[PDB]
Structures are given as structure tokens and as C-alpha cells.
């Protein structure tokens, strides 16, 4: 399952920057024309970056989002970017504008288990403003709520009791998305955020999230 013991350097700190100290890239009315798609002049007030790069697993499905108004939701990075010196990279988190709008904001309920014992989690934390939303948009918001309550990506010294963890997104239409919190490969953002390369977009109609936390 998940092993916190395999420190692999500054991986703990970098994972905390991805989910807790994140400046999540949020955009609704944005179109591109440049397997990677470049967004010219994406960053309005940023001294480091001006443009945004979106990488995908397969180039065959990359043309589906390429030409149309697409909604952006995900975490961007600067270190080890394949472009000059003013561009930020990102993996997936792309959804179409057509039929992906709802009247009243969806309130997805979250369930958590701490070594067997069930803990009440408020539904106001995780929210999606689209009909078919990406796994990245739900994962970033769920891990942020966890980190604030029980220090997830903090060292044993800085009160981090969680050693093993698993996050699941219920079988509402088709099989569930299973991911281990400490099982992300690599130590830098370019490898840790590589899980969203497939660009998995699932239905947000009456779905729920189940998180399994273990102290040992």
C-alpha cells in the first residue's frame, strides 16, 4: 500500500507544496492553439511565468481539447519544464465547456476512517462546478482538507502520525479511481503530479469519496 518510511529526500515537502501550499490554476473561458498544448499569456500577474504547458499520456486523445473553450483545474510547476525560462508545466486537468455547467454547486460527501474508527467530514470542503469533472480537481481539494485537520505531508517531528493512506472515488457509472497517498513516484513535482497524465474525467452526479487513513 503506502510507505512513508521511503523518504526519497525532499519528497514530503514537495508533496505538501502540491496539495497544501498550492496556487491552483483556475480558468473557465480559455482557448488554445499551440502531445503538449501551450496557453499564451496565461499568467496575468506572475514574475516567474507567463505561459502554461499542458502534457497528456497520449497524443491521439490530445486533439479533443486542443480546439475548443476548455476549463483548467490543476497544480502547475516550474522546476524541470520542457519548453523559455518563463513557462509553467501541468499534467491533465482539462474539461470541455459544453454541458459541464450546473444550477446549484455539487456537494460531494467525504468519508474517513482512522485505523477502523469513522470520522465525520463536512461536505462543504470538496466542490465541483462541472457535470463531468477531472479526478485532479477532486483530489487537490480533498488532500488540502486532510493536511489541515491531520498533518498528512509533515514529518514525524512536525506531528505527522499518518504513515499509510488510500483515497478512492466511488463506482457511480464505471470502476473507481484507486490511489495511495504515499505511493507517488519520484521526489520532484514533475514526477509526483504525473498521475494525472491519463486525464480521467468522471461523472459528478451523486458520487462520494472514501479515504482510508492508517497510523502504522
Amino acid at each position, epitope marked *: 500500500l503506502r510507505k512513508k518510511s521511503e523518504l526519497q*529526500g*525532499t519528497a514530503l*515537502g*514537495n508533496l*505538501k*507544496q502540491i496539495y497544501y*501550499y*498550492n*496556487e491552483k490554476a483556475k480558468t473557465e473561458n480559455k482557448e488554445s492553439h499551440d502531445h503538449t498544448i501551450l496557453f499564451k499569456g496565461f499568467f496575468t500577474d506572475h*514574475s*516567474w511565468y507567463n505561459d502554461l504547458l499542458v502534457d497528456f499520456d497520449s497524443k491521439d486523445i490530445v486533439d479533443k481539447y486542443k480546439g475548443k473553450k476548455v476549463d483548467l483545474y490543476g497544480a502547475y*510547476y*516550474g*522546476y524541470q519544464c520542457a519548453g523559455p*525560462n518563463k513557462t509553467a508545466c501541468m499534467y491533465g486537468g482539462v474539461t470541455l465547456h459544453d454541458n459541464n455547467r450546473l444550477t446549484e454547486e455539487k456537494k460531494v460527501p467525504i468519508n474517513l476512517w482512522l485505523d477502523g474508527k469513522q470520522n465525520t467530514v463536512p461536505l462543504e470542503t470538496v466542490k465541483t462546478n462541472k457535470k463531468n469533472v477531472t479526478v485532479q480537481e477532486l483530489d487537490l481539494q480533498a488532500r488540502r482538507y486532510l493536511q489541515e485537520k491531520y498533518n498528512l505531508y509533515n*514529518s*514525524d*517531528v*512536525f506531528d505527522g502520525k499518518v504513515q499509510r493512506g488510500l483515497i478512492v472515488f466511488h463506482t457511480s457509472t464505471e470502476p473507481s479511481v484507486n490511489y495511495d497517498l504515499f505511493g507517488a513516484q519520484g521526489q*520532484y*513535482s514533475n514526477t509526483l503530479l504525473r498521475i494525472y497524465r491519463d486525464n480521467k474525467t468522471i461523472n459528478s452526479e451523486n458520487m462520494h469519496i472514501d479515504i482510508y487513513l492508517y497510523t502504522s
Partner: T-cell receptor, first 109, second 113 residues
Framework: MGIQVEQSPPDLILQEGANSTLRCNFS?????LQWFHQNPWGQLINLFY???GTKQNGRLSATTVATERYSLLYISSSQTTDSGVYFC??????????FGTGTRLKVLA | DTGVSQNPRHKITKRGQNVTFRCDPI?????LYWYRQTLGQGPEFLTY????????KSRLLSDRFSAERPKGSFSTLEIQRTEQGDSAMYLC??????????FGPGTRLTVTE
């Protein structure tokens, strides 16, 4: 992780308006070299950046050679304001700079 | 001006207390560096950042140390429990190229009984 730097001389006693040459030696091959000045208030002032060749700016001169693995710092007509500790920032990791022991300089008027 | 600001500039704390230091570098600068300097000695490397992620942490660095880079360019260095020998000048620097390192005034920490 492993980079050894020894600055010669460790202590320098010089008269007002006199010339002096302090050197910085390093073990492994180096891509980036830096020379700093520390004032009694505790602030590092970047004097020179010499990865290779020689640079001439103001009253201070600096030369560095990557072959023989050594750096040099010159002080033409040294004043009482030049008194302080001169450091040698050396880089092997990706871009990580590691400071040396430091050359203690005290200009006597 | 030095170019790189550091708040606070002087801090006094009791043995076994939590302390934090904020470093505000130049907006354009991609890199950030953390150094520790004692009385009449050279500054020892602690940890350095490149853009959004932490690149390396020193082997000699204690487990009570944690450098975090929140929303923006600034970085925060924290000490869990204050011990003897922690009383040192904590220097912060920034790099663009990263050719030249621009140093700040540095926080002077004093760990008293």
C-alpha cells in the same frame, strides 16, 4: 555532497594603502565561483562572480582557473573600509553554493 | 537597499520554544538559499529551492528544521524545539541565473534559559 575548500591565508595583517593577494583552493571541478565581503553588522556583499578568466571592476581584481583548481582576490591600495572577512562560494550539486573557512582581513591605519 | 528582505532581524526565545523566520527575495529571482552562520565562522549550507520545489537538504541539518515555500516567492524556516547551539545568524539568498547570490541582513537568534 562532498566539496572541500581551504582559503589561504587564514589571517591577514596589512598597513594602509598597501597591496595583498588572498587565494581560494578547491578539490573537485567547479562550474561557478563567487567572492563575497562580510562587514561587522553581518551582511554578505557580492564582489565578484568569476567561473573562468579574469574580471576588473573598481579597485578590486579577481582571477580564476578551472584547470589548476584555484581562485585569487587582489586588493589595490587597501583602505580601512576593506577590513572584514572575505568568503569563497564554490559550486560543484546542481547549483548548490558551499562557502569556505573565510579570509580574515584587518587593515591597520 | 540590500535587495532581499528578512523579517524579523532580531529574535529572543526560551529553551524549548517554537520560532519562525520569513525571507522576502526579489520577485524575478527563481532560486532561494538557506544558510547558518555562527561566531567567527563560515556560513553552513542548510537547504535550497528552485522555483516551487525543494531541491536538496543538508545531511548535518537537524530533524527539528523545516523550510516551507508558501503561495508566492517568500520562504519560511521553522525550528521545533530551541536547544543550545541554535543561537546563530540565519542568512537567506536569492539567484536568477543562478549566477549571482544576493544576501539579506539575516535574523539574529538568541536561545536563553
Amino acid at each position: 555532497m562532498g566539496i572541500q575548500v581551504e582559503q589561504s591565508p587564514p589571517d591577514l595583517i596589512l598597513q594602509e594603502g598597501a597591496n595583498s593577494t588572498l587565494r581560494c583552493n578547491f578539490s573537485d571541478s567547479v562550474n561557478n565561483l563567487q567572492w563575497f565581503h562580510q562587514n561587522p553588522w553581518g551582511q554578505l556583499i557580492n564582489l565578484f562572480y568569476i567561473p573562468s578568466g579574469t574580471k576588473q571592476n573598481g579597485r578590486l581584481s579577481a582571477t580564476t582557473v578551472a584547470t589548476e583548481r584555484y581562485s585569487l582576490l587582489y586588493i589595490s591600495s587597501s583602505q580601512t573600509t576593506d577590513s572584514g572577512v572575505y568568503f569563497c562560494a564554490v559550486d560543484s550539486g546542481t547549483y548548490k553554493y558551499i562557502f569556505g573557512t573565510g579570509t580574515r582581513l584587518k587593515v591597520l591605519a | 537597499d540590500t535587495g532581499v528582505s528578512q523579517n524579523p532581524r532580531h529574535k529572543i526565545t526560551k529553551r524549548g520554544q517554537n520560532v519562525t523566520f520569513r525571507c522576502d527575495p526579489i520577485s524575478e529571482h527563481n532560486r532561494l538559499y538557506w544558510y547558518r552562520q555562527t561566531l567567527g565562522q563560515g556560513p553552513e549550507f542548510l537547504t535550497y529551492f528552485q522555483n516551487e520545489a525543494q531541491l536538496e537538504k543538508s545531511r548535518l541539518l537537524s530533524d527539528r528544521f523545516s523550510a516551507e515555500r508558501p503561495k508566492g516567492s517568500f520562504s519560511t524556516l521553522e525550528i521545533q524545539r530551541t536547544e543550545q547551539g541554535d543561537s546563530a545568524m540565519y542568512l537567506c539568498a536569492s539567484s536568477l541565473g543562478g549566477y549571482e547570490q544576493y544576501f539579506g541582513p539575516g535574523t539574529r537568534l538568541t536561545v536563553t534559559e
